[PDB]
C-alpha cells in the first residue's frame, strides 16, 4: 500500500493548506469589513468594536506568519519530501495569543447575542459582511466568532492526520509527534479550546470505532451526534438489521459487528414520510409495517423504510429527525429573513436618500425612465460614507440587484460600477397591501354577524338631536367593541377597519358627509338600512336580494347514450319543458315525463335562460359525457292512465299502507304512461286505496285477475331502490283500448326557492335553495340495521361457540354467569330478529319519505332508526364573475328515543378498548400468517448477502410477535380476564404473563436453528407461531366473552338507534357533499376567485388526505327544554362514536335503479364500521387515487351548541350543569376542529412543496396565507367563545353559531344543523348560514345580508317543513338576537 500512504500524506498537506487559505481568508475579510467599515459611518461604540473583533487582529498576524511559514515549506505545491513540524514548534509559543481571546470569547458571544436583538445594530453588523464580499445567507458571524477557536483545535487533529500517513523514515516524523504533544497541550491548557477539542474528540472517537469509512471525516461536517441505535432497514433486495447514527448534517448506517461502514446520507438530500400501523405496499419492497417511516434520498432517487421495535423508538427517531430538520432550516430561514430585511431597510433608506433633490440620481435619461448610473451610486455610497472601498460598492449594488431591490434597464447586465443604467423595483409598483382589502368582506360579515348575535345589542335605536335613529352604532363604541373582542390591538387598527368597511359599502355615517372616525358620530350598516326602510325616498328601496319563483321538483339522473341522453326539450308558455322522452331510454328509466317544466340542468337554472342557450347547455354536458342532473316540475299528487293489457302486467306493486310502485319494466306502456318506481298509490279508477293492500290495487287490472302472481311479463325490470334490484337479481339466480287510471303521490320531492340578487361585481346572480328529502334514508337505515344484524350474527355465533366449549357447570357462580350470558345471547338474538324485521319494514316503506316527528310515543319500530325530519338544504349558486357551486347543509331533528348521563363513560371507554383490542389482535395474527408465507417464499428463492437479508426478515417476524405480546400483556386484557373469571379456559392470567418465557425459548431455538441447521428453521417458526396463534385466539375469546358480559343490551339498542339516525344524516350529508364535489361543485374557497373544478378537486384530495369533518350546529336549548337536553346528551356521545366510522368507495353500475348515483353498503362491527359508497363509473373516476385503491376515509366530527334565545332569570343548580355540559361539548369540538385544521395546514404545506415550477409554489404560498390568516382568526374567536377570559363572559351572545359555521365551512366540513323539531330553530341558522355564504363567498352585496337572512326565514322553501309537520308544536324564538328573529315590517310607511 505504498502509493496510498504517499498520496494520502499529500492529501493531508493539501487539506492543511486549502483550509488555512480559506480560514486566513476569513480572518482577512472580517478584519477588513468590521473594523474599517464600522468607523466610516454610524450605532456601535469604540469599546464594543474592541470587545467584538480586536482579538482577531492579534491572532490574525500570528496566522498570516504561520500561513507564510507553511506555504514556504509546501512550495510550489505540496510534495512528499516536505517538512512542517519545526513550523508548528516555533509557532507553538505564538499560539498562546489565544489565551486572551478565549478569556474574552464568552463576553464577545454574549455581546453579539444582545447586539443582534437591536434591529439597527444587527442590520449594521450584517451589512459589514455584505460589503466585505461575504454572502450573509451562507455563514453567520455567530459561527465566525467560534471559527478561530475551532481552527486552533483543528491543528491537533491536522497533526494527528499527517502522523497517520508519514513513515518513521521521514525526518518530520519525530518533530510531528513532538508537535502533536505541543498542539494538544496548547489546546488543553485553555478552557474554550478544551471544550471544542473534547466535542471533536467524541466525533473522532466514534470514527475510530468505525472501520471501512467513506467520504469526509465527522469532525469536518458535523458538530455532534444526535442519536444512535439499531433499526431494521427494509430495502429493495431484502431487510437488513443495522445500526443508524444521526449527526447534525449526516445520517450514517453500518453493519454492526464497534461497527463497519455501509453507507451515509446528508440530511439535506434526505426526505421523510410517515406510514400508518397495518399499512403494506407496492412500488415499495415491504410488508405489514407497524412502528415504521419512509426515507427518500432525493439525489439517488432511493426510497427505504426504517422500522423500530416499539412505537416509543419510532417517536424518538422521528422527533430527532424533525428537530435536526427544524434546527438547520430555522438557521437558514432566519439568516435569509434577517439578511433580506436589512437589505430592505438600507434599500429603502438609501432610496429615500436618493429621491431627495439633494441627490436626485433617479432621473429619466429609446428614452429610459426613472433610472440611475451604477458608478454614481457607488461614488455616492463613498460620499455619504456608507463604504470605504469601490469593491464594497459593487458588492452592495450586486446584492441589491440579486435581492430584487434594483435591476438593469435593457434586460442584459449584472451590477458593475460602469456607467450602466439601472432602476429600483419600487418604480414598476412591485409592493402592495391589497390582502387587507379582500379580507375586509370576510371580517365585515363576521363582524356584522357577531354584533347582531348579541342578546343585549350594541347596534340599536339611538336618538341624535332629540330625534330617533333606528339601528345605529357610535363609531367610538364600534372601536371599543372591536378591541374588547381582540379583533384589533389598537384603536388605530379599528379605525382603519372602519374606513375600509365604509369604502366597501358595509356601513355609513348617519349623514353622507363623514368618514369613519373614533368620534361620537352615528354609524349604520346598510343591512339595517334596507330592513328598517331608512333610504331617502328618491332611491325607491330597490330590493337587491329578491325572490324569483317557488319550485316543486323531482331530481333525475341520466347517463349519456350512443347519440344523446335519451330526450329532447322545447319552449312552451315561456318555459323550457320536456318535448319527447325516448322509449326505453335511461331518461325514461329515470322517470322523465313529456310536458314537464325543467328547473335546472346540472344545477344551472335553465328556466331563466333563452331556449337556444339551454340546448347549448345540454349539448355541452353531453359533449363532455357528464352524467346529467335535472330538476323537473313534479306535483305532490298526480294522475296516470295505463292500458289494461289482457295477457301480462308490465309493473310490480307492494307495500301495505300505502301501497307503492315497487318496480316498472323498461320501455313498457306503464312507463310511457308515467308509472315510475316509489310512487305511493292513492286511488284506482277513483276508488280510494290509501289503506288497502297491493292485491286490492292489482285486482283492478285484467291480467292480475286472470293470472295472480304469474301476471309479470319478461320485461327488463327497473326498481325503486338498489335493494329491490338486488333481491330481484338474487331471486332470478335462485331460479336458474281499455284503460285504468291511477292517482299517485310522488315521494322524494325537492321544494326550492330561486332567489335573485345583484353581486358586488355588479352582475346578476341566482341562488337555488332546496329542501330535499334524503332519498337513501330508509334504504340506508335498513342497510345499517342489516349490518348490525350481520355483526351481531357473527358475535352471537362466536359467543355461543365459546359457551359450547365450556361444557361443564362446576359451581353456582358458573351457573349464574352462564345464565347471564345465555340470557344476553338470547337478547342479542331478539335484537338480530328485530333488525331483520325492521329492515324488511323499511324496505317495505316508501311514504312518508322522511320520519315526521312522532305524534305519540310507541314501542320500537323500523322508522325509529331513520333520522327525524331529516332534510338536506342544498344551495346552488349561479355565476359570480360560468361559475356553479353547491353547498350542502343537512337539517335533522336532534336524534331521539340521555346517553352521556346513562353511560358511566368508563363503560363506553372500556367497550371501545375491548372492541379495538379484539380488532387489533385479529389484524396482528392476520399479518403473522402472511409473514410465515413471506419467509417460505424467500427460502424457496434461496434454495452472507442471503444471510443478511434472511436475518433481517426473521428479526422482523420477531418484531411482529412483540407487536402481539404488547397487546396480550396489557391492562385491557387483564381487566377482561377479571370479568370472564368464571369461564373455563386452557390458560389463567398468570400463565400468559409467564409465557413470555415461551417466546424467549422460541427465539433461542430459531437462533440455534440459524447456527446449527438452517433447514429446521420453518419447523421452529411453525412451532412459535402455532403457540402464539393459540394465545391470540385465547385473547379474542376472552374479549368477546368480556364484551358479552359488559354490554348493556337495552342501552345498546338505544345507542344503535341514535347512531343510526345520526349516521344516516351524516352519510346523507356527506353523500350530497361528495356528489357535489365529484360533480365539480363544492367550494369552501369561492372568496379567492377559485374555479369550482379546482376547489372540488382540492377538497376531494384534502378529504382523501385528512378525513371528512362533519360539523354540527347542535342548536339545542339544554338549559331550558328537557326533551332537547336528552337529544343533546345522546348526539354528543354518538358523534364521538361516529368518529370511528370509515367511508370507502367502490365502482358499481346499475341501469336497473332510477335516480341514484350512490348506493350505500355497510361492513364491519359497530366500532370500526365501514360505509362503502358505491358510485357510478363517472363519479368513481373523479375520486382521488387513494380512495379509488379501496383505502378507508376517516370521519371526524365536531358539535357546536349555543342557545338561540337568551336564558331569562338566574339558572337553577341543574340548569348550571346543563350549561356546563354545553360548554364541555363545545370544548371537545373545538379541539377536534383545531386538529382537523392542523392536519389541513400540514397537508397544504406538503401540497405547496409538490414538484412544480417554483413561481407556482411562490404564488400558492402567497395565496394560502389568506385562507390561513382568516382560519387562525376564526380559531382565536372560537377559543374566546368556548373559553371566555374572566370578566369577558356573557358578552359574546350566540355568535358561536355564525362563527363556528364560518370555520367549519372554510375548512370544507360536511355541515349539519339540528334542534328538537328540525323545523324552526334550524330554519334560523340555515337561513343565516346560507345568507352569510352568499355574502362571504359569492359577493351578495353586504346591504342584502340581513334581507336574504329574513327572506329565507319567511319565503324560502323551508316553510314546507312546517306544511309537512302541521301537527307538531314548535316555538319561534322570542328571546333571540336580531340576526335570528324575523324583522317586523317598517313602521314609517312608504311600501
Numbering used by the authors: 42 to 83, 90 to 304, 324 to 431, 436 to 806, 839 to 983, 1015 to 1030, 1063 to 1108, 1212 to 1659
What's the paper's own text on this?
P-Rex1 and its close homolog P-Rex2 are highly conserved GEFs that activate Rho GTPases (Rac1, Cdc42, RhoG) to coordinate cytoskeletal organization and cell motility. P-Rex1 is a 186 kDa multidomain-containing protein with an N-terminal catalytic DH domain, a PI(3,4,5)P3-binding PH domain, tandem Dishevelled, Egl-10 and Pleckstrin domain (DEP) domains, tandem PDZ domains and a phosphoinositide-4-phosphatase domain (IP4P). P-Rex guanine nucleotide exchange factors are autoinhibited, synergistically activated by Gβγ and PI(3,4,5)P3 binding and dysregulated in cancer. P-Rex family members are autoinhibited under basal conditions and are thought to be synergistically activated at the plasma membrane by receptor tyrosine kinases (RTKs) and G protein-coupled receptors (GPCRs).
Despite ongoing limitations imposed by preferred orientation, we obtained a final P-Rex1 single-particle reconstruction at a nominal resolution estimated by Fourier shell correlation (FSC) to 3.8 Å. However, due to anisotropy effects, we estimate the true resolution to approximately 4.5 Å consistent with map features. Clear secondary structure features are present in the maps, allowing us to accurately dock our closed 3.2 Å DH-PH-DEP1 crystal structure and the 3.2 Å DEP2-PDZ1/2-IP4P15 structure into the reconstruction (T4L was omitted). An AlphaFold21 model of the previously unsolved four-helix bundle (4HB) IP4P region allowed us to build a complete model of autoinhibited P-Rex1. Overall, full-length P-Rex1 is locked in a compact conformation with two distinct domain halves. The autoinhibited DH-PH-DEP1 domains form the N-terminal half that makes extensive contacts against the surface of the C-terminal DEP2-PDZ1/2-IP4P half. The interacting surfaces are conserved between species, with the PH domain buried in a cleft composed of the IP4P domain core and the prominent 4HB region. The DEP1–DEP2 linker seems to act as a flexible point to separate the N- and C-terminal P-Rex1 halves. Intriguingly, the P-Rex1 PI(3,4,5)P3 and Gβγ membrane-binding prenylation sites are off-axis by around 90° in the autoinhibited structure. As such, we hypothesize that the cooperative binding of Gβγ and PI(3,4,5)P3 to P-Rex1 at the plasma membrane results in the counter-rotation of the N- and C-terminal P-Rex1 halves to align the membrane-binding regions along a single plane.
